[PDB]
Scaffold this active site. Structure first.
Site, PDB file in Angstrom:
ATOM      1  N   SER A 181      73.055  47.716  -4.388  1.00 16.07           N
ATOM      2  CA  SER A 181      72.848  48.092  -5.780  1.00 16.07           C
ATOM      3  C   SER A 181      72.273  46.942  -6.606  1.00 16.07           C
ATOM      4  O   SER A 181      71.434  47.160  -7.481  1.00 16.07           O
ATOM      5  CB  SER A 181      74.162  48.585  -6.391  1.00 16.07           C
ATOM      6  OG  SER A 181      75.254  47.790  -5.954  1.00 16.07           O
ATOM      7  N   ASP A 221      87.964  46.139   0.202  1.00 18.00           N
ATOM      8  CA  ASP A 221      86.898  47.105   0.480  1.00 18.00           C
ATOM      9  C   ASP A 221      86.555  47.203   1.966  1.00 18.00           C
ATOM     10  O   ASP A 221      85.457  47.624   2.333  1.00 18.00           O
ATOM     11  CB  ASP A 221      85.643  46.768  -0.337  1.00 18.00           C
ATOM     12  CG  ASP A 221      84.720  47.967  -0.525  1.00 18.00           C
ATOM     13  OD1 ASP A 221      85.221  49.111  -0.576  1.00 18.00           O
ATOM     14  OD2 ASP A 221      83.490  47.763  -0.626  1.00 18.00           O
ATOM     15  N   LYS A 240      85.867  48.317   5.523  1.00 16.31           N
ATOM     16  CA  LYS A 240      85.392  49.592   6.075  1.00 16.31           C
ATOM     17  C   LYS A 240      84.459  49.379   7.270  1.00 16.31           C
ATOM     18  O   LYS A 240      83.873  48.303   7.404  1.00 16.31           O
ATOM     19  CB  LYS A 240      84.703  50.439   4.994  1.00 16.31           C
ATOM     20  CG  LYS A 240      83.598  49.737   4.221  1.00 16.31           C
ATOM     21  CD  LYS A 240      83.157  50.588   3.043  1.00 16.31           C
ATOM     22  CE  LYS A 240      82.098  49.892   2.206  1.00 16.31           C
ATOM     23  NZ  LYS A 240      81.608  50.770   1.107  1.00 16.31           N
ATOM     24  N   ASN A 288      81.331  47.645   6.541  1.00 15.72           N
ATOM     25  CA  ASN A 288      81.456  46.204   6.323  1.00 15.72           C
ATOM     26  C   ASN A 288      81.628  45.395   7.604  1.00 15.72           C
ATOM     27  O   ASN A 288      81.287  44.209   7.648  1.00 15.72           O
ATOM     28  CB  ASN A 288      82.616  45.904   5.373  1.00 15.72           C
ATOM     29  CG  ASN A 288      82.249  46.108   3.920  1.00 15.72           C
ATOM     30  OD1 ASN A 288      83.116  46.093   3.051  1.00 15.72           O
ATOM     31  ND2 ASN A 288      80.962  46.294   3.645  1.00 15.72           N
ATOM     32  N   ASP A 294      80.634  41.389   3.164  1.00 14.95           N
ATOM     33  CA  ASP A 294      80.914  41.905   1.812  1.00 14.95           C
ATOM     34  C   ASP A 294      82.209  41.336   1.233  1.00 14.95           C
ATOM     35  O   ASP A 294      83.301  41.840   1.500  1.00 14.95           O
ATOM     36  CB  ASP A 294      80.902  43.447   1.776  1.00 14.95           C
ATOM     37  CG  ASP A 294      81.144  44.016   0.376  1.00 14.95           C
ATOM     38  OD1 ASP A 294      81.049  43.268  -0.621  1.00 14.95           O
ATOM     39  OD2 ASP A 294      81.424  45.230   0.275  1.00 14.95           O
ATOM     40  N   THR A 331      86.148  51.734  -1.729  1.00 18.40           N
ATOM     41  CA  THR A 331      85.578  52.974  -1.203  1.00 18.40           C
ATOM     42  C   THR A 331      86.692  53.995  -1.013  1.00 18.40           C
ATOM     43  O   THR A 331      87.688  53.725  -0.339  1.00 18.40           O
ATOM     44  CB  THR A 331      84.824  52.750   0.127  1.00 18.40           C
ATOM     45  OG1 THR A 331      83.872  51.694  -0.036  1.00 18.40           O
ATOM     46  CG2 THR A 331      84.089  54.013   0.560  1.00 18.40           C
TER      47      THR A 331
END
Ligand SMILES: *CCC(=O)NCCNc1cc(NCCS)ncn1
Length: 281
Positions: free
Chosen positions: A22, A135, A137, A140, A153, A167
């Site tokens: 982003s 975060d 996941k 990641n 991350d 998330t």
């Protein structure tokens, strides 16, 4: 102590776009003098300042510098020009864990066991240095040439010394209720990953974030009929609504008991990154 010459964009031959975030763009690049492949994360300062992500980019830099462990992505260098920041990160050749989950449908007993062990091994490091991922996941968790994990991350991670929601699917219930994350938030996230490695899907899924959030607080998930029994128990001891009752948390007296769990009976925690990861079905 003299650090190596402060690098610049011209020092590289840029290649393909590995990922698009982003606030940043990650491009594979080759250093000219050495001929080394680094994955340079490129972030536009002006877009960072406007979106108030100044703390997030700084935190990502500070953490990834501090980490000195094989299961974590290394930050080799930082440099910048007028409008952009460049982050010299290591290149995870094989890609996402999620990529390899989708590719094979679901991990079998040895594969799950091995890759679960590596996450635990890495979490023990991260929490030992007083950092909470918040975060964690399959996206990641990245994999290098030799197919070992490299967790990435850390912009949204929380560094402890004595406010964010992750998330939806790997979010721990205590974030949705008390707005306070702990080391065990990652241990919840760990359980979901263990489930996902076996099932092929995370434990809590729905049409939207709200319904996923709804299922988490109610603890609404159940196991398939073939689910590994020793992996099931671990998940059960990890996916608990009370964070103080989660196998591995400080109240459960550190990581020792977590590693001891029957599911890690054959695992030699000695040097996992030097070991050979099992081939994927
Ligand atoms: C799951 C999406 C994906 O494939 N992303 C690119 C991951 N590849 C990669 C990442 C990195 N560093 C991660 C920094 S955010 N280096 C090299 N390859």
């Amino acid at each position: 102590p003299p650090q190596p010459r402060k690098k610049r964009p011209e020092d590289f031959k840029f290649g393909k776009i590995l990922g698009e975030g982003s606030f940043s763009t990650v491009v594979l690049a080759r250093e000219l003098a050495t001929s080394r492949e680094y994955a340079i994360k490129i972030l536009e300062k002006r877009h960072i300042i406007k979106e108030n992500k100044v703390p997030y980019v700084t935190r990502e830099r500070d953490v990834m510098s501090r980490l000195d462990h094989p299961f974590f992505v290394k930050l080799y260098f930082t440099f910048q020009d007028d409008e952009k920041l460049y982050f010299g990160l290591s290149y995870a050749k094989n890609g996402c864990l999620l990529k390899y989950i989708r590719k094979i449908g679901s991990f079998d007993e040895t594969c799950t066991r091995f890759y679960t062990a590596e996450i635990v091994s890495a979490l023990e490091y991260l929490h030992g240095k007083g950092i909470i991922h918040r975060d964690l996941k399959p996206e990641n968790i990245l994999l290098n040439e030799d197919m070992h994990i490299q967790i990435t991350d850390f912009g949204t991670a929380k560094v402890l010394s004595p406010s964010f929601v992750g998330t939806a699917q790997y979010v721990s219930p205590e974030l949705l209720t008390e707005k306070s994350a702990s080391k065990s938030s990652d241990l919840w996230a760990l359980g979901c990953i263990i489930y996902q490695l076996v099932a092929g899907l995370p434990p809590f899924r729905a049409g939207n974030e709200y319904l996923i959030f709804q299922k988490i607080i109610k603890l609404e998930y159940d196991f398939p009929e073939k689910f590994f029994p020793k992996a099931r128990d671990l998940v059960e001891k990890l996916l608990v609504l009370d964070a103080t009752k989660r196998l591995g948390c400080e109240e459960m007296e550190g990581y020792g008991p977590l590693k001891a769990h029957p599911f890690f009976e054959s695992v030699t925690w000695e040097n996992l990154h030097q070991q050979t990861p099992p081939k994927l079905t």
